[PDB]
Amino acid sequence: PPYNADFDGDEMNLHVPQTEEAQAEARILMEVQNHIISPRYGGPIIGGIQDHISGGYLLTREGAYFTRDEVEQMLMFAGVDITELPEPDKYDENGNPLWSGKTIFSLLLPEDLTVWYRNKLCDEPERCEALEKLIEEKLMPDPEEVRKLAYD
């Protein structure tokens, strides 16, 4: 998105700084991770596009569940340094354990993050209003109470 580039024949140039001061300037000022937030409107410019959002929805949608091998393989593929799987979310028939998408996604978030908002999939405002009321009445709701009112 920052380059406004798509892989349909676009060509892009590359330059190599030749002096140590120029290399230091490029390394300190011009690193990509420095410019995540756009200066035009104070919002992110680098972010997930297309398949990233679609896969996120597929992973975190209601009813999504994964098996032992899928969870291990996807965590190893993502590069997460996990060494012990969490408790299974539900048990399938034949005794197989299953993990929900929420649990898998939560392993990537910082340990102390807290936030709530409304996304583009909101279609029944009563469901969101109930959750907002529950969060407003006490700033720390019981997770087992939120999971009864969970809505996409």
């Binding site: 032992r68 091998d69 291990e72 393989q73 190893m76 593929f77 996990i82 060494t83 012990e84 799987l85």
Partner: protein, 94 residues
């Protein structure tokens, strides 16, 4: 085939396996997952082009047995299954 150790712990082993790809890696990890003493095991290709022949592994156990021993058990089970499949194929094809 070469084993190049990346890092190891009391119950963790992480190693490259050069000269291999998904064909043997997936079978090995799926055989390992049958062992009840393996807590976490998986493999990945760090890059489909440069690391096409270098699948990275990670094996973690609960301390009952050494990961290097679980690997031996899995590789022996693979051999037994292959041989017993071959006998049935020979007996059925003629």
């Amino acid at each position: 085939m070469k084993i190049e150790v990346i890092k190891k712990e009391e119950n963790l082993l992480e190693f490259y396996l050069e000269g291999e790809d998904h064909t043997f890696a997936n079978l090995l990890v799926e055989t390992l997952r049958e062992n009840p003493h393996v807590k976490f095991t998986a493999y990945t290709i760090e890059h489909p082009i440069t690391m096409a022949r270098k699948p990275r592994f990670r094996v973690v156990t609960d301390g009952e047995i050494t990961p290097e021993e679980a690997l031996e058990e899995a590789a022996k089970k693979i051999f037994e299954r292959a041989k017993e499949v071959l006998e049935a194929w020979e007996k059925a094809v003629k």
